[PDB]
Write a protein that binds this DNA or RNA. Structure first.
Ligand SMILES: N=C(N)c1ccc2nc(-c3ccc(-c4nc5ccc(C(=N)N)cc5[nH]4)[se]3)[nH]c2c1
Length: 91
DNA sequence: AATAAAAGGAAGTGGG
DNA sequence: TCCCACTTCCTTTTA
């Protein structure tokens, strides 16, 4: 099954949910969620995974935070903003 | 207060 | 057995 960081990168590449997520500086890999429209993106993640419960942005961001140590995705000191690693952006 | 963003410990679920 | 890669639950903290 697809990994969360890959789901997000795929969305950013396709533009399919541009009202929920967008690049801030794509060269740096920084991206930002919509305050008002992030829940619809979280719902889509849960449905893609076939999880038992409805996915929420809160639970999706809980998963995102686990990438902090390994480095695939890091939180940026800006509202609803995160940053992919160079490895993730290259691969 | 109401609302939201951010955090993280801990236990549960998948598929190896 | 026991890690993967989250998911789910609950509580706290800050703005
Ligand atoms: N509404 C808003 N416009 C808004 C905008 C930006 C915000 N940036 C925050 C936070 C930053 C740090 C926070 C925090 N540091 C913690 C340490 C420990 C724990 C714990 N559970 N031990 C919890 C913590 N939370 Se909250 N809140 C914002 C709100």
């Amino acid at each position: 099954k697809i990994r969360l960081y890959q789901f997000l990168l795929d969305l950013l590449r396709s533009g399919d949910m541009k009202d929920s997520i967008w690049w801030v500086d794509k060269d740096k890999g920084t991206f930002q969620f919509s305050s008002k429209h992030k829940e619809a993106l979280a719902h889509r993640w849960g449905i893609q995974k076939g999880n038992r419960k409805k996915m929420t942005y809160q639970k999706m961001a809980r998963a995102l935070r686990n990438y902090g140590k390994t480095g695939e995705v890091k939180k940026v000191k800006k509202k609803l903003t995160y940053q992919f690693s160079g490895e993730v952006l290259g691969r």
